[PDB]
Amino acid sequence: FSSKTEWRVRAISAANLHLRTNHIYVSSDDIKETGYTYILPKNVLKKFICISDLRAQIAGYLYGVSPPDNPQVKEIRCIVMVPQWGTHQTVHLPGQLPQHEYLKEMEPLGWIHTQPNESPQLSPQDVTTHAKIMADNPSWDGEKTIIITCSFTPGSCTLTAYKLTPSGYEWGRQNTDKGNNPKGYLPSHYERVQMLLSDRFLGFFMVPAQSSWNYNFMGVRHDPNMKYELQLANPKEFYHEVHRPSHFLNFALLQEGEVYSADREDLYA
């Protein structure tokens, strides 16, 4: 980013993200039928789209349970936002997975992220990210956890859901190179999975304890090994004042400017 002009164009843009919110598409494609099927409550989806930005990927972590007596469907009941920052093609979020009390009741279902340009494939950066989570986390089950990619289409939003195949998981555990075309990448690595939106139940948010989630505007304050706690509260928007301290901390001024126009007229209170 240009860090001056680049900030503002996208900033007055994102104030319209809520317009997208009511036009969304969902990939319908061939159902494995032996697979799990994930239901995403619409409210969290709306809010998640609304906090995002149209260039930097933001990501969120999925937490849910399967409804009683129906083990093959996973309701996503919660999204957790952790300290993070994006690129246009990927997202850097820390090594620690969410730990918190409200979360103990549910299982992790993977993660969801915004995707500035729509691609009909799981980006190598993703399969690599996911495998590398999975390597370090037994908590995440290969077969149960997914990557939901939410892409910004014109005036719209459109989303797909992927699972790593074991081929993919091994490649990704192995993979170093984060470029858009790493060696040995294959369409054999991922698999699409069945997902539905729902108005039947409401999902909720988990959000960083002492800060907010969006570190894009401080990259030096973000570290892979950084630790965080959580709370029950909603995410602030991308360009929210808090995510942007450096800019509100731009004041170089001498007080005596106030000497000029010392006619104080007030008369009201």
Binding site: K4, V242, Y268
Partner: protein, 1722 residues
């Protein structure tokens, strides 16, 4: 005739206050025009003072009244004009107008007008007692207000009267300025503050308002002053209470018009003085410049300045007023460099080299400003900008004449007062950001700055020089000589003025609007100069009164307000209706174009980016434009702002936006134009942004109300949130703040750190302590919540706010404001919000707020409860309220349908004798009754009938009663109501319905066990209240009269829900248990209001669903129209006051000609509201509309009255009812109302229950009331409200009944939900539990834990627990869930009961009652009470202790605390016999101690607390006796005997050491002197008296002597005989038996005579034995005798058998019958 629309644009005056209505002017005498090249110059000489009139002298400060003289010190004589009008000032309330030139000293005239009022309230032994009056001083300028409060304070301080500026934000400082008198303010301040209502708490305490510099009428600001005064006058006409008005003006024509406006009688009230009365004569110089080109002009004026200044360069003083900030010093240095360019000519401003103190100007060298350059020479500069103190240091320098040239600004003339020999006004033109352009300065600005010309002391005559543009040269002559008309700019503002008056409710319709405008200055000006104001003389003749013009006028305003949605007004009715948008508009003084711009622009989804733009679009900024030259800087500023403007390019929107940001971001601006502009924008921004917040909050859109309140704070504090909150404490160093901002360490993480750990972060440890102070000074709340579901739709929330911060009134001040708002799942919608305000006193006191919130079909994971400070930035606490475990109640089945039946005639019951008590009242039973009839009458089974109050269920009960009547001659029936008032109300009816007509005896239960027992069993129908029927019937196993009852009736069973509900529940349950054991069925009939859960109640009380009738509130004999009126004012006084007018209107609307009842929160409020109804009754031009008979008819009724105001209120048809009224007064008022004589009655809330007179319309006013105990207001209990509502029923006549409920904003939705729906009812037994288990264990109804659980299953609690488990904190709906719950319950109840030693728990299974519990159960006393007793009473306790111990009793915490009872009880406690140890005066235990001592000292108090005293006394004796029992059981002689003594002292109302004779009636204290001097010390002494000296002692009166004789007969004459059985044979451990034998020769008749006691009582006696030497109670017994007794008591012999003891004998009532006999055994 129909109105016509007109254009208000061409009808106003542009360039107001520069108007110059006259196009012709005048010379003064010696004046001449001399025109030079490029400039005309006009000269007028000084005026000639009017020669002193024949025998006219000045008045010294001696010869005017004694009191006022104080505070005039330093001043020996009065000014000529002051001396002229002082007489009318202090001797008359007649309104004043003075017109006198600047310098005449007008203030000190008005001061006197104040010293009169200050004198109107005075006392001998105290002076100027200050709560009677407040004065309002309106001054035109801010500096002037400041300095005025400054000097007024000093001056009036001798009186000790507190005068302050009103700069207050409304809410924090109201309660601050409450105690403030003579408050000074700008007209505007007064107008907003009146529009909000901050004034309406002040007014009617205002006898005086000063309008200072009232010629401001001519300014654009004029309409404000016009709005003030108009309101004041128009208001006085309604209230009939008057006010003095004192106008002060510069000398100008139109004086008589301003006189008419102020309602000043021209005869005695008008005062005029021309320009000759200026104390320092003024020679006027005016140079107008003809040059068109400004470029040449900015030379010419420079040169005129130079020549004029060199003219005075000799010994003299010049002062230059420039209208620029910077040019104060740009004008100087021009004069300097010119004098240097003059070859050192003009220099030597002194008498020599060293002379005239050039070392004064040189030695003052180093200073803050640019002065260091100018000061070495002859001149300097002054203004607010460059320095603070050096301004005062320059003023000191000018007064002492060390500087003869000073260039400055208008704020110097308006601020601290110093004159100059000659002053020179450069240019007269200023920059108006409001107007967007340059304009000539105002009238008052020149008048003020040129009225500074010449000194009062060091000067002979003053001159002044106005350098202006030739075109305006005429204008400035019409001013400074009196040629100028004062005209009103009112038309421009007319739409905004009208709104705010509708907003205050002062104008309902078009007519009231024309009436209002008839009070305007513009009205008298339109009358006396129509030619100027747009009225041709012919159509003026056609409408002389201007009725049709004032109707046309205001019609356009009405249309403008309608089109912008401030008002909904249809042309047909002519009526206005206010909208919330309108109110917001008025309250923020924002124009009606801006507000509609906000209405259309503002949407829920707005970003900050957009919020700013919408702000920028405010119509208030319409004239602001962007100049080419500044567009260079604006761009830079545009890239240095945090919030993107980029939506807009360079246009006004951008300029305004970037400006606001610049101000918040704290940025200095190079251009002057931009600076002034920015100032305008930011000053208006507070009100603007705030009105946005208010709007967007009322809508409920969460996110944007956050963004907007935060913006508000950011404007107020001048910073972004991203900056450290510590900055709002200005006390802090900047570098330290910046240092803590350097490292990012989140602020809320500062609380964990101590003083050292703080300093370690920024490595500045020296600061470590101070920082800490601030961190804990920063307002912090912690909050807890208790949540329980009410219905599937609604949850109840109890929020507990606990202050976490250290209060300092030099920071937090008198009050701190917080918004609590509960937001929905996404923090999207605000489900509810309240304004919570924590006062100074109550920091550290946890406040409890209770409110309900809705829930919706996809039950959400949680709500959020947010709390945020109003003014404080970055100060917030959020509380997730999680529903993850919530279990919603079962949805409630539909109410049983009201069948369509042939309405049942009274001819149904075949009994004629029954028909008789109905037929002559009503022809037919209502559908409810007729549907219940066959079930309740022709059939024997238990029924439940719910129908909303007013449905006639009483006679439904009477049906069942009649059935029982047929069933058996002697058939027995018990009837219960939860309200004692309602009980008496039932008894009065049923006694005539049954005992009178049907011969069947009817009774009403009372306090005493004995009398009550005797009562039932003689009666067929027993009417009682739950407590009376608990104590009796707990023991039911022994009392056959309890068991044999045929019918049992519970009325208002929904009352189970409320407190004192558990007792009701427990007695119905018990009733069922009895019917279980008696083997005979006992029919139960229960009556409730509409109940959603009626099924449970029925199932509990054993009604089959087929006999259950639960009806919807929409089924009522007489339909009800319910209306709810929300009021957004949280402060209760203001709210209550501002619903006064709506009350009257509610009558005139809903029930103009029909009976009306008004319920009020306060005992006293009833009077006040009756008054206000009458005073606003006059307004309507309609007097005594509520009186339906002539005054001659009311006289027989009014003869019976004490209350004097009640006579008045009744005379006009109102009247009131409350606690203090004599029962005769009340009966009378009720009679007058029901008979139809008076149409309206205002009644205390307490009387809602026991009131036997109904109405057509009922208006509930303000549903909260005041509780002294927690010092807060608390809502009316819902059932109460429903009862008040049910009080509008008139089935005999009306086809409808009406109710209006005026309540707070918060409480609106709650009523909207729960008044219409049937009500849910839950059990409270779980909380109030111990007492009953104890009592029941005592009866051996609970023999062991199992019996306890079983007992639980008979209750309503048992029923409800599984229905709505989350309410009872039961976590599951399962079997073992409920089972485990009840188990844990009896477990802890029995444990807590065993800990208290009321029971013993054996093996862990069985239970038995112990001593304590036995007592408790016997006297019906709370268990904690007698536990307290158990740990309190000791061996050495005596009456001093017994007073406080018996006071702390639980039954005495029901005693409440009223408005300001903290001073009252202190004043009483001062004078009582026993003082207390640091007592809190809001505590009811303390209050009952003091009331009790008061009763013992026979002190007569107010009837208010006297009622209270009587209630305490009612239950006192029981407690006392319980103490006797605890003490005797514990084995202590002295305290026991003393307690019996206390019983006696309470009975006869006297202290322990006192005359025993004072028990006799008509016996004074002065009687005791001669009685004791005679030698007669007791009643046994006056027994022997024959009829010779008996009445011949002191006073002889046959009636009183007989009244004493009956007492003497009734006084106990009792002879005992005591022996020890087999005295000579006694062994250790052996039984000792002492037999006592009582007899009485006194005639046995009647009860104890003790007139000072509310209860009738019998003679109780204790026969005690004890060894008095060891303070040991050896034995005891209790008895009631009546003419014969035999009482034997025994104990266990100690030691060897050679011993001696004491026999005692004692009463509970009479003093002095106590008998001791010391005896020896062996």
């Amino acid at each position: 005739a129909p109105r016509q629309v007109l254009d208000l644009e061409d009808l106003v005056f542009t360039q107001g206050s520069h108007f110059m209505a006259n196009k012709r002017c005048q010379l003064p005498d010696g004046s001449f025009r001399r025109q030079r090249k490029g400039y005309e110059e006009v000269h007028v000489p000084a005026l000639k003072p009017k020669p002193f009139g024949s025998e006219e002298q000045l008045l010294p400060v001696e010869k005017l009244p004694k009191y006022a003289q104080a505070g005039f010190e330093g001043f020996k004589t009065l000014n000529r004009i002051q001396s002229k009008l002082y007489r009318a000032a202090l001797e008359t309330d007649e309104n004043l107008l003075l017109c006198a030139p600047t310098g005449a000293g007008k203030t000190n005239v008005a001061l006197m007008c104040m010293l009169r009022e200050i004198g109107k309230h005075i006392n001998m032994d105290g002076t100027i007692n200050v709560d009677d009056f407040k004065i309002i001083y309106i001054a035109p300028m801010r500096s002037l207000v400041q300095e005025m409060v400054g000097s007024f304070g000093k001056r009036l301080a001798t009186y000790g009267i507190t005068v302050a500026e009103l700069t207050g934000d409304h809410q924090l400082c109201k309660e601050e300025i409450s105690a403030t008198q003579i408050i000074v303010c700008t007209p505007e301040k007064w107008d907003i503050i009146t529009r909000k209502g901050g004034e309406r708490t002040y007014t009617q305490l205002v006898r005086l308002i000063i309008l200072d510099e009232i010629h401001l009428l001519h300014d654009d600001r004029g309409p404000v002053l016009e709005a003030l005064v108009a309101r004041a006058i128009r208001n006085i006409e309604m209230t009939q209470e008057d006010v003095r008005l004192i106008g002060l003006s510069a000398t100008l024509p139109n004086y008589e018009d301003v006189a008419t406006f102020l309602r000043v009688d021209p005869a005695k009230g008008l005062f005029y003085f021309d320009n000759s009365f200026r104390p320092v004569p003024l020679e006027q110089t005016y140079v107008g410049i003809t040059e068109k080109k400004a470029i040449k002009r900015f030379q010419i004026m420079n040169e005129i300045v130079y020549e004029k200044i060199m003219e005075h360069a000799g010994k003299n003083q010049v002062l230059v007023f420039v209208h620029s900030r910077k040019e104060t010093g740009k004008t100087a240095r021009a004069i300097r460099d010119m004098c240097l360019e003059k070859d050192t000519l003009g220099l030597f401003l002194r008498e020599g080299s060293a002379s005239t103190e050039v070392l004064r100007t040189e030695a003052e060298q180093c200073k803050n400003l640019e002065l260091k350059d100018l000061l070495p020479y002859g001149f300097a500069i002054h203004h607010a900008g460059m320095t603070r103190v050096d301004r005062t240091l320059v003023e000191d320098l000018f007064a002492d004449k060390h500087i003869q040239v000073l260039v400055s600004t208008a704020t110097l003339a308006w601020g601290v007062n110093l004159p100059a020999h000659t002053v020179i006004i450069k240019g007269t033109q200023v920059y108006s950001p409001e107007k967007g352009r340059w304009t000539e300065l105002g009238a008052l600005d020149i008048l003020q700055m040129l009225g500074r010309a010449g000194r009062p002391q060091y000067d002979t005559k003053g001159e002044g020089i106005l350098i202006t543009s030739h075109g305006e040269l005429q204008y400035y002559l019409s001013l400074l000589n009196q040629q100028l008309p004062i005209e009103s700019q009112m038309v421009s503002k007319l739409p905004d003025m009208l709104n705010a008056e509708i907003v205050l409710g002062n104008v309902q319709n078009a007519k009231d609007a024309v009436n209002w405008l008839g009070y305007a200055y513009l009205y008298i000006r339109m009358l006396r100069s129509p030619t100027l104001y747009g009225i041709s003389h012919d159509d003026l003749k056609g409408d002389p009164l201007l009725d049709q013009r004032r109707l046309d006028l205001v019609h356009t305003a009405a249309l403008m307000l309608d089109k912008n949605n401030l008002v909904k007004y249809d042309k047909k009715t002519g009526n206005f209706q206010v909208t919330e948008l309108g109110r917001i508009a008025s309250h923020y003084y924002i124009t009606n174009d801006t507000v509609q711009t906000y209405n259309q622009l503002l949407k829920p989804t707005l970003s900050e980016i957009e919020l700013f733009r919408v702000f920028s679009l405010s119509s208030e900024f319409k004239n602001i434009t962007v100049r080419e030259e500044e567009k260079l800087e604006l761009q830079k500023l545009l890239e240095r702002v945090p919030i993107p403007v980029k939506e807009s390019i360079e246009e006004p929107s951008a300029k305004i936006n970037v400006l606001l940001q610049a101000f918040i971001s704290q940025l200095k601006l190079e251009g002057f134009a931009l600076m002034a502009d920015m100032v305008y924008v930011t000053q208006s921004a507070g009100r603007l942004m705030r009105a946005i917040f208010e709007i967007v909050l009322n809508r409920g859109w969460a996110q944007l109300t956050d963004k907007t309140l935060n913006l508000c704070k950011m404007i107020d504090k001048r910073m972004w949130q991203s900056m450290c909150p510590l900055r709002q404490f200005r006390k802090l160093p900047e570098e330290v703040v910046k240092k803590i901002e350097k490292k990012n360490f989140p602020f809320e993480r500062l609380y964990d750190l101590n003083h050292n750990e703080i300093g370690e972060l920024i490595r500045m440890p020296k600061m470590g302590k101070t920082i800490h102070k601030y961190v804990h000074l920063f307002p912090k709340l912690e909050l807890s919540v208790h949540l329980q579901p009410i219905t599937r739709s609604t949850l109840k929330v109890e929020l507990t706010i606990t202050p976490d911060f250290q209060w300092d009134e030099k920071v937090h001040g008198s009050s701190e404001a917080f918004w609590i708002l509960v937001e929905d799942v996404d923090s999207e919608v605000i489900l509810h919000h309240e304004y919570f305000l924590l006062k100074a006193k109550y920091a550290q006191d946890e406040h409890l707020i209770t409110f309900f919130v809705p829930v919706f079909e996809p039950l959400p994971p949680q709500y959020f409860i947010r709390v945020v400070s109003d003014r404080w930035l970055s100060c917030e606490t959020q509380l997730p309220v999680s529903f993850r475990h919530l279990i919603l109640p079962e949805k409630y089945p539909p109410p049983t349908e009201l069948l369509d039946l042939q309405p049942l005639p009274v001819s149904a019951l075949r009994n004629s004798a029954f028909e008789s008590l109905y037929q002559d009242k009503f022809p037919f039973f209502n559908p409810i009754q007729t549907q219940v009839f066959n079930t309740v009458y022709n059939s024997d089974d238990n029924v439940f009938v719910g129908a909303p109050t007013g449905s006639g269920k009483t006679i439904c009960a009477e049906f069942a009663i009649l059935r029982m009547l047929l069933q058996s001659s002697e058939g027995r029936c018990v009837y219960i109501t939860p309200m004692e008032a309602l009980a008496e109300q039932v008894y009065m009816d049923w006694y005539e319905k049954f005992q009178d007509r049907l011969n069947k005896k009817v009774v009403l239960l009372t306090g005493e066990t004995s009398t009550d027992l005797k009562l039932l069993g003689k009666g067929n129908i027993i009417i009682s209240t739950p407590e009376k029927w608990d104590i009796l019937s707990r023991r039911w196993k022994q009392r056959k009269n309890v068991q044999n009852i045929n019918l049992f009736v519970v009325d208002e069973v929904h009352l189970i829900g409320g407190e004192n509900g558990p007792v009701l529940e427990v007695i119905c349950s018990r009733m069922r248990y009895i019917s279980s054991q008696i083997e005979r069925p006992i029919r139960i009939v229960a009556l409730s209001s509409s109940l959603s859960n009626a099924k449970d109640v029925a199932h509990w009380l054993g009604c089959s669903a087929t006999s259950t009738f639960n009806f919807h509130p929409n089924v009522r004999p007489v339909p009800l129209e319910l209306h709810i009126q929300g009021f957004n004012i949280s402060h209760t006084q203001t709210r209550l006051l501002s619903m006064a007018k709506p009350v009257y209107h509610a009558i005139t609307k809903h029930s103009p000609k029909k009976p009306v009842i008004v319920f009020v929160p306060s005992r006293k409020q009833t009077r006040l509201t009756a008054i206000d109804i009458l005073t606003t009754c006059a307004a309507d031009i309609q007097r005594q509309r509520f009186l339906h008979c002539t005054e001659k008819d009311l006289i027989p009724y009014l003869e019976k009255l004490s209350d004097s105001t009640l006579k008045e209120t009744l005379l006009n048809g109102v009247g009131y009812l409350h606690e203090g009224l004599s029962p005769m007064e009340r009966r009378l008022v009720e009679q007058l109302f029901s008979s139809g004589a008076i149409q309206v009655v205002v009644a205390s809330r307490s009387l809602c229950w026991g009131m036997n007179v109904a109405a057509h319309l009922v208006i509930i006013m303000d549903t909260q009331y005041y509780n002294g105990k927690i010092h807060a207001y608390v809502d009316y209990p819902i059932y109460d409200v429903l009862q008040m509502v049910g009080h509008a029923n008139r089935p005999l006549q009306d086809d409808e009944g009406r109710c209006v409920i005026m309540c707070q904003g918060s409480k609106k939705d709650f009523f909207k939900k729960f008044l219409y729906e049937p009500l849910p009812v839950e059990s409270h037994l779980d909380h109030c539990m111990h007492d009953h288990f104890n009592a029941e264990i005592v009866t051996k109804t609970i023999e062991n834990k199992q019996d306890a659980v079983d007992y639980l299953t008979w209750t309503f609690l048992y029923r409800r627990m599984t229905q709505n488990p989350n309410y009872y904190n039961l976590q599951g709906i399962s079997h073992r869930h409920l089972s485990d719950h009840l188990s844990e319950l009896v477990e802890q109840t029995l444990s807590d009961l065993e800990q208290s030693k009321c029971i013993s728990i054996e093996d862990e299974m069985d239970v038995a009652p112990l001593n304590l519990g036995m007592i408790a159960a016997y006297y019906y006393i709370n268990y904690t009470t007698i536990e307290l007793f158990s740990m309190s009473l000791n061996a050495k306790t005596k009456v001093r202790g017994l007073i406080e111990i018996i006071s702390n009793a639980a039954e005495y915490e029901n005693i409440p605390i009223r408005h300001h009872e903290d001073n009252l009880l202190r004043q009483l406690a001062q004078k009582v016999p026993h003082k207390l140890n640091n007592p809190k005066f809001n505590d009811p235990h303390v209050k009952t101690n003091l009331l009790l001592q008061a009763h013992l000292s026979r002190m007569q108090l107010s009837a208010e607390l006297q009622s209270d005293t009587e209630e305490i006394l009612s239950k006192a004796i029981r407690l006392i006796q319980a103490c006797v029992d605890v003490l005797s059981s514990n084995g202590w002689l002295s305290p026991a005997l003393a307690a019996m003594e206390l019983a006696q002292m309470v009975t006869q109302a006297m202290w322990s050491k006192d005359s025993y004779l004072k028990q006799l009636p008509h016996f004074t204290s002065e009687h005791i002197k001669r009685c004791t001097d005679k030698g007669v010390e007791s009643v046994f002494d006056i027994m022997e008296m024959e009829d010779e000296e008996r009445n011949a002692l002191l006073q002889l009166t046959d009636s009183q002597i007989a009244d004493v004789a009956r007492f003497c007969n009734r006084y106990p004459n009792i002879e005992l005989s005591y022996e020890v059985v087999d005295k000579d044979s006694i062994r250790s451990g052996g039984p000792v038996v002492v037999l006592v034998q009582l007899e009485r020769e006194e005639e046995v008749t009647g009860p104890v005579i003790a007139p000072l006691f509310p209860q009738k009582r019998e003679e109780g006696w204790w026969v005690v034995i004890g060894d008095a030497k060891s303070n040991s109670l050896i034995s005891i017994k209790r008895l009631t005798l009546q003419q014969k007794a035999k009482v034997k008591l025994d104990f266990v012999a100690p030691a060897t058998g050679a011993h001696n003891y004491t026999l005692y004998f004692m009463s509970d009532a009479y003093m002095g019958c106590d008998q001791e006999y010391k005896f020896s055994v062996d």
